[PDB]
């Protein structure tokens, strides 16, 4: 009987853009696997939450 | 700030003088030229002094 096409919010994409500006911001002089760890674990729990809406 | 690493600790860093062979440069095994132009950091970066002109 209907449908509903969904997406992330606009609040939710800002988040995570801010949490990898973090990371590139708070680098400095930090190993270059700690920084990867970082990015894996943001995508993860970005693309694990919001799984279809990242599509 | 973390201690520039010494040239020493390096070693093996010959004070060769040949400037070039075969149009290729040659590199000095001494780092003070690299460190000189940015230091090194304590666990092997290199913070580049802002080459400010």
């Known amino acids: ?55 | 700030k973390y201690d520039i690493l010494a040239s020493e600790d390096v070693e093996g860093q010959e004070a060769a003088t040949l400037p070039s062979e075969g149009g290729v440069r040659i590199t000095p095994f001494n780092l003070q030229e690299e460190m000189e132009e940015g230091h090194f950091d304590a666990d092997g970066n290199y913070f580049l002094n802002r080459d400010a002109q």
Do not use: P
């Open chain 1, 1 to 55: 009987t209907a449908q509903c096409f969904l997406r992330v919010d606009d609040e939710s994409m800002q988040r995570f853009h801010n949490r990898v500006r973090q990371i590139l911001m708070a680098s400095g002089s930090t190993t270059f696997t700690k920084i990867v760890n970082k990015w894996n674990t943001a995508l993860i729990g970005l693309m694990t939450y919001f799984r279809e809406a990242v599509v």
